[PDB]
Every structure is written in C-alpha cells, then in structure tokens.
Amino acid sequence: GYTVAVVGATGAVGAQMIKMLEESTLPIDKIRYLASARSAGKSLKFKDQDITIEETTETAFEGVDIALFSAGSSTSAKYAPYAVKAGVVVVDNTSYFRQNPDVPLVVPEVNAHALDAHNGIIACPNCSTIQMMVALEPVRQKWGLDRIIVSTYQAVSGAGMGAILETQRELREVLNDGVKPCDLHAEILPSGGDKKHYPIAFNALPQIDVFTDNDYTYEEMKMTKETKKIMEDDSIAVSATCVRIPVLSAHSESVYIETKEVAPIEEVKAAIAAFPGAVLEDDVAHQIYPQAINAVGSRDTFVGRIRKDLDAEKGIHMWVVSDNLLKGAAWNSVQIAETLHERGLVRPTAELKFELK
Amino acid sequence: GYTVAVVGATGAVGAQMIKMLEESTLPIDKIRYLASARSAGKSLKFKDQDITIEETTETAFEGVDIALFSAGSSTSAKYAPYAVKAGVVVVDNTSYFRQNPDVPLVVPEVNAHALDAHNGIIACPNCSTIQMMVALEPVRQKWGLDRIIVSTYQAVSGAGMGAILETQRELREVLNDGVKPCDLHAEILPSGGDKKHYPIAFNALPQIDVFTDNDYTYEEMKMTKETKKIMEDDSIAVSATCVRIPVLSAHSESVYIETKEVAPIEEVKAAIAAFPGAVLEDDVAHQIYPQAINAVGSRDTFVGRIRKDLDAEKGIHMWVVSDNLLKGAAWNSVQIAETLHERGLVRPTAELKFELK
Ligand SMILES: Nc1ncnc2c1ncn2[C@@H]1O[C@H](COP(=O)(O)O)[C@@H](O)[C@H]1OP(=O)(O)O
Numbered sequence: 106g107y108t109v110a111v112v113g114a115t116g117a118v119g120a121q122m123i124k125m126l127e128e129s130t131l132p133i134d135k136i137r138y139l140a141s142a143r144s145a146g147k148s149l150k151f152k153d154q155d156i157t158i159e160e161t162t163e164t165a166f167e168g169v170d171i172a173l174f175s176a177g178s179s180t181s182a183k184y185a186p187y188a189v190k191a192g193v194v195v196v197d198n199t200s201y202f203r204q205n206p207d208v209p210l211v212v213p214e215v216n217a218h219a220l221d222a223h224n225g226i227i228a229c230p231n232c233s234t235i236q237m238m239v240a241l242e243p244v245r246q247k248w249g250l251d252r253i254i255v256s257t258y259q260a261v262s263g264a265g266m267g268a269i270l271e272t273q274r275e276l277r278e279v280l281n282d283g284v285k286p287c288d289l290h291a292e293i294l295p296s297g298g299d300k301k302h303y304p305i306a307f308n309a310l311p312q313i314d315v316f317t318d319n320d321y322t323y324e325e326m327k328m329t330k331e332t333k334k335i336m337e338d339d340s341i342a343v344s345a346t347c348v349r350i351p352v353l354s355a356h357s358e359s360v361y362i363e364t365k366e367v368a369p370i371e372e373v374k375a376a377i378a379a380f381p382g383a384v385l386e387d388d389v390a391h392q393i394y395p396q397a398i399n400a401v402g403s404r405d406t407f408v409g410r411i412r413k414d415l416d417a418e419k420g421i422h423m424w425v426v427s428d429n430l431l432k433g434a435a436w437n438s439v440q441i442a443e444t445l446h447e448r449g450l451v452r453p454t455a456e457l458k459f460e461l462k
Numbered sequence: 463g464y465t466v467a468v469v470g471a472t473g474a475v476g477a478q479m480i481k482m483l484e485e486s487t488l489p490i491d492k493i494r495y496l497a498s499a500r501s502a503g504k505s506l507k508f509k510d511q512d513i514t515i516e517e518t519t520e521t522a523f524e525g526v527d528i529a530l531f532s533a534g535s536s537t538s539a540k541y542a543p544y545a546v547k548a549g550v551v552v553v554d555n556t557s558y559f560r561q562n563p564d565v566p567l568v569v570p571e572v573n574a575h576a577l578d579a580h581n582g583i584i585a586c587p588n589c590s591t592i593q594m595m596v597a598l599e600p601v602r603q604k605w606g607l608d609r610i611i612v613s614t615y616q617a618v619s620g621a622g623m624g625a626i627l628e629t630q631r632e633l634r635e636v637l638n639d640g641v642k643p644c645d646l647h648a649e650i651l652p653s654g655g656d657k658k659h660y661p662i663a664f665n666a667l668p669q670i671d672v673f674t675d676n677d678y679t680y681e682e683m684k685m686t687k688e689t690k691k692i693m694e695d696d697s698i699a700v701s702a703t704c705v706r707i708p709v710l711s712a713h714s715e716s717v718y719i720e721t722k723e724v725a726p727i728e729e730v731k732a733a734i735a736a737f738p739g740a741v742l743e744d745d746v747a748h749q750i751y752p753q754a755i756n757a758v759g760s761r762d763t764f765v766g767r768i769r770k771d772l773d774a775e776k777g778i779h780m781w782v783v784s785d786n787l788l789k790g791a792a793w794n795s796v797q798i799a800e801t802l803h804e805r806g807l808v809r810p811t812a813e814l815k816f817e818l819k
Pocket residue numbers: 112113114115116117118119139140141142143144145161175176177180264265266267
C-alpha cells in the first residue's frame with residue numbers, strides 16, 4: 106500500500122481530507138498528519154487509530170508516496186518542491202502551482218487525461234471553480250461554450266475554520282445580545298490578509314480574496330483563468346462576481362452561459378444528469394432545486410433552475426450547488442489521488458521542475 | 463392638509479410607511495391606520511398620538527385624500543377601486559395594478575412624468591426592481607441599455623413580518639440549540655402561498671414567489687416586465703435569477719448590463735453618483751463597496767464594484783444595494799405621495815377605470 110501524508114490536517118479542509126481518506130478505496134499502509142509547530146505533538150484520529158501530528162519541515166517527506174496539501178499557498182510553495190524531491194506525488198489544494206504549465210489543474214471528470222504527464226504536483230482547482238466545471242463540461246461537450254457569466258453565493262468555510270467561528274459568533278451577538286449588524290467587530294472576513302474587516306452576519310460581502318489591478322478580486326480572476334486551463338480553451342469568455350453570504354458550508358452559483366450551438370433545455374438537463382459527479386435536481390412543479398443545506402456532506406454537484414434566456418438564442422441560466430469542502434477541495438483531492446492510483450501514476454518523478462526555496 | 467390612510471399598517475412594510483410618513487414633509491391633518499379584522503381595535507403610534515387600527519372595508523375611505531396600500535395583492539384588488547371611487551389617490555405597493563395601462567408604475571427619479579395622467583392609482587414597483595432602476599437609469603440616459611442579466615441576494619423582510627420571525631427562530635435554533643439546518647421546520651419561505659416550505663438559515667433559496675409556465679418565477683418575471691414599463695422600452699432584454707439569502711433587511715444585486723454605446727467606467731461612476739437617489743460606494747483600494755448592513759435605514763441606493771466585462775466591449779458589472787422596506791417599498795411610496803403633492807396631483811379622479819370586486 107501507500108504512505109499518505111495530510112499537510113494542514115488540523116484545518117477546515119484538512120478535517121474533510123481525513124474524512125475522505127477514511128472513506129477512500131486507496132490502499133493505505135501508513136497515514137501521517139502534518140501541520141505547523143504549534144500543532145505538533147497533538148493527537149488526531151484516523152478511523153479508530155491515534156495519529157500524532159507532526160511539524161511540516163523540508164525533511165519530513167521521506168518515504169511518503171502521496172501528500173495532500175491544504176495549508177495555505179505559503180506552505181505549498183515552501184515544502185511541496187522538497188516533497189517532489191523526496192519522491193512524493195503532491196496533490197495541492199492551494200492556488201500557488203495552478204497556473205504553472207508543468208502542473209496539471211484537474212477535475213477528474215473533466216480532464217483526468219492531464220494527470221498522465223504530471224511532474225510530481227497536481228493542483229486542485231478553486232472550490233468556486235470546480236463545481237461550475239462539473240455542471241458545465243457536459244454542456245460544452247455537446248453544444249460548446251462561448252461565454253460564462255457567474256455570480257456566486259459562497260460559504261464562509263472557504264476562508265477556513267476561523268471564518269466559521271467568526272460568522273457563528275457575530276450571528277449570536279445579533280440574535281442574543283441585540284447588537285446591530287453594522288456595529289459588529291470582525292477580524293477575518295472578507296479577507297484575512299486584507300487591511301479592513303467587515304461583519305458577515307445578515308450581510309452579503311462582494312469581496313472574496315484581495316483585489317487585483319483590474320478591479321476584480323483574485324477569486325473572480327481565478328474562476329476566469331482556471332476555467333480556461335481546465336477546459337483547455339482560452340477562447341471561453343469568463344466574468345465573475347464572487348460574494349460571501351451567511352452560509353457555513355456549500356457554495357451556490359447563479360451561472361449564465363452562451364453555447365456555440367442552440368442547446369435544447371431538456372437535452373441539457375439530460376446531459377447534466379448523465380455526467381459523472383453531477384446530479385440533476387430540477388423539478389420546478391414540486392419546487393425542486395439545489396440547496397446549500399441539502400448539498401452539505403455530499404460529494405455530488407447539484408444542478409437546477411435550468412432555463413433558456415428570455416432573449417439570447419443560445420443563452421442558458423442555471424443554479425449550481427456543491428459542498429465547498431468536499432468537491433470544492435477535500436473530495437476532489439482524494440479523487441485525484443484515487444485516479445492517480447488507477448492509472449499507475451503514483452511514483453517518484455525523475456526530473457525536478459520546481460525550485461527549492 | 464391631507465387625510466392619509468395606511469392600509470396594512472401593522473405589517474413589515476406598514477411599520478416603515480409610518481416611519482417614512484413621520485419624517486415626511488407632507489401636510490398631514492389626519493392619520494388613519496387600516497388592516498385586517500385581526501388587528502382591528504388595536505393601537506399604534508403616529509409620533510406621540512395613539513391611533514386605533516380599523517378594519518379595511520369598501521366604505522372605509524370616506525374623507526381620505528391619500529391611501530398607501532401594502533396589505534397584499536388581494537387587499538388592493540378588493541379595496542383600492544372603492545378608494546378611487548370615494549375620491550382617494552392610491553399609492554399601491556403590490557403587483558396587482560402594475561401592468562395596467564391606466565396605472566403609472568413610478569420611481570420618481572426615473573419616471574415622475576408618468577404621474578401627471580394618473581387615474582387614481584399609482585403603483586409602487588417591486589422592491590428588487592426599484593433599486594436596479596435607480597442604479598441603471600443614469601447609465602441608460604447617457605449610453606443606452608441593450609440588455610440586463612441580474613442575480614439577486616434578497617432579504618426575508620420582502621416576504622413579510624412572519625418571514626422575518628421564521629428566519630430569526632431558525633437561526634436561534636441552529637446557533638443556540640444546536641439543531642441541524644436540514645432538520646429545521648419551515649412554514650413560510652420560500653413562498654407562503656406555495657405547496658412546500660424550506661429552511662432559510664445557512665441556506666440560499668433560488669425561489670421567490672411562485673413558478674410561472676416558463677420556469678422563471680413571478681419575481682424574476684416582474685423584474686423583467688417592470689423594467690420595460692418604467693424605462694418605457696420593451697426592447698431592453700432582461701433575465702433574472704432571484705434568490706433568498708439569510709438577511710433580514712436590504713436587497714443586494716449582481717447586475718450585468720450591455721450598453722448601446724461604449725460607457726467608460728470612470729464616467730459611469732460619475733453618472734451614477736450624480737443621479738438623485740443613487741450613491742456611489744466604489745473605492746476598491748480601500749475595500750469600499752455597498753453592503754446590506756450599511757444600507758439598512760437609508761433611503762438611498764448604493765452602487766459599487768463597477769467594472770467592465772473582461773471580454774464584452776459594452777459589458778459592465780456592478781453591485782447594487784438598498785433597504786427593501788424603504789426605497790424598495792415605504793420610502794418610494796411616500797416619495798410618490800410627496801411628488802404628487804408637489805405637482806398638485808392629490809385630488810379625486812372623475813372617471814373610474816377600475817373594477818369593483
Ligand atoms: N507553516 C505551516 N506549516 C504547516 N501547516 C500550516 C502552516 N501554517 C498553517 N498551517 C495549517 O494550515 C491549516 C489552515 O486551515 P484553516 O484555514 O482552516 O485554519 C491549519 O491546519 C494549519 O495548521 P495549524 O493548526 O498548525 O496552524
């Protein structure tokens with residue numbers, strides 16, 4: 106079997122990575138948990154076994170077959186190249202290596218073929234991107250994609266464990282203490298690294314990550330750039346507005362598309378239903394549509410509210426929901442590892458293509 | 463001065479109609495509060511005065527100069543024509559009369575001119591529609607509007623007092639009692655009249671109002687049809703996705719437009735800031751954008767995140783927020799009444815144009 110390491114085991118994604126690995130078919134002989142120095146020494150469960158958390162260092166990756174990273178882009182930048190040097194296949198859940206031409210950016214149902222030519226690092230895409238790709242690929246395959254306009258309704262767990270606790274605390278202060286939402290104190294959201302912080306309780310914050318030079322945030326631009334790489338088509342127009350709402354788990358997305366050829370709605374519904382990883386939840390007569398609360402805990406991506414634009418001949422609207430910690434992160438990563446196993450791609454990489462920092 | 467009646471004075475909008483009237487310049491000699499049988503006999507304040515709530519009847523409008531309705535479509539259908547017959551000028555905050563050619567559908571900053579030929583009823587547009595009209599009218603005036611795509615982030619107060627209480631209860635059950643969102647019992651949302659009811663706590667519900675036969679909801683279709691009437695241009699392509707989120711007050715909207723002529727963003731920002739009722743909150747370098755929690759209690763409409771589409775030459779994205787009970791309802795209605803007073807338009811209508819039910 107394999108030696109599997111989880112880097113960032115104590116985090117929000119790391120917790121789900123453990124859960125997904127527990128429920129995985131992957132033949133695991135040895136499991137290892139890695140985090141920062143302050144977590145080292147603590148005990149954490151794998152099934153019923155007790156595992157001691159280790160500190161992530163440059164020499165900690167010897168003998169490891171597969172490493173799942175979700176400890177922020179700074180940890181991946183620093184330790185992933187040393188892992189590859191040690192002969193590990195890295196599945197990275199950060200944005201750091203995503204736009205590197207030597208790194209496959211993979212959603213297994215969409216571009217598993219890209220895994221074959223990997224150089225030791227496989228990048229897991231952004232959570233907001235992944236669920237959109239699962240929903241849209243079956244459409245692209247049959248009728249093509251000209252443009253995408255998406256407005257997101259993102260859960261706070263995407264920003265990590267602290268964001269969840271901040272959201273819960275804020276909501277308690279308003280409902281129990283009667284504090285006006287606009288008077289709340291925030292420490293993390295919208296972006297932990299940005300200069301100013303705003304309450305999320307009873308609010309919709311149109312900022313996820315920091316702003317780029319073009320007045321779109323990095324989150325919005327990641328949706329643009331990642332879609333183009335995943336679907337291997339730079340001609341797909343993508344513009345996004347990414348908004349945080351008071352949901353703890355599961356992203357929701359209002360997705361507008363224009364196809365190359367006119368796509369009959371009932372055929373679109375059927376194509377999405379037939380696509381692996383995508384589940385059609387669309388029966389408006391009985392008020393059936395994807396819901397954040399229903400998607401929590403499931404690996405599947407749920408699609409509904411499918412309808413043609415009222416004016417644009419090739420325009421289609423839809424509603425896409427998936428657990429952001431599962432398909433958006435931990436499950437996509439474990440599924441990548443399972444696909445690597447399937448294809449016999451779990452082995453050391455001879456040529457080191459990533460500079461050691 | 464005027465005798466002013468508030469129909470639906472006890473409701474979520476009604477409470478704000480009282481506040482807006484209390485802060486109004488309108489010469490009010492007498493105030494009357496009208497509701498249903500179950501509120502009849504109870505007392506509510508107007509400033510320091512105690513006002514006895516009366517049951518709304520076909521004979522309850524004698525001596526009334528102005529009546530502000532917000533008691534549901536059925537109430538307006540039943541009683542508004544009897545008010546018009548009595549000599550009242552009705553400002554109606556329901557969808558019932560909005561698409562009647564004999565009824566002005568007014569946002570005062572946009573189409574106040576339509577008030578002049580009123581036949582006793584002026585319809586206040588849908589709350590989600592109004593704020594979009596305030597943001598986009600200054601853009602339309604200078605560069606035209608070819609199309610609108612909108613995804614909304616709507617507050618629960620739009621669905622009435624019960625929906626607010628349901629939302630607070632559900633959140634309290636999750637946060638204080640540790641109830642799972644899936645296990646919550648809902649009675650009103652997404653739509654009180656519809657067959658099935660879903661939790662809103664930590665959820666995003668892509669249904670507002672009932673579904674129509676084209677698979678768009680009535681809320682989505684009202685945004686489409688009201689836009690065309692208010693802007694007096696049936697050629698403006700409009701498609702909407704309307705979603706309820708865990709917010710009590712203030713709607714947020716991700717608005718995509720394509721103009722007729724290329725609209726420089728810096729000029730677009732200036733045009734919006736110069737438009738009455740619209741405030742520019744757009745300074746991304748300092749993370750300044752409209753927020754629901756900041757908009758609560760303000761009559762203004764806040765616009766930000768203004769940026770051109772990444773591919774479409776004439777495409778512009780923006781973020782629009784306003785208090786749905788104020789500009790979306792109570793303030794727009796009071797502003798209509800004030801504009802009616804300004805133009806000497808508060809007087810009986812000789813010819814009845816509306817059916818007595
Ligand atoms: N320098 C680091 N090396 C290894 N892991 C890190 C480092 N910095 C942060 N992490 C881990 O990344 C994760 C962040 O997740 P979240 O955003 O949900 O808190 C945590 O598990 C955290 O572990 P630790 O608990 O030791 O800080």
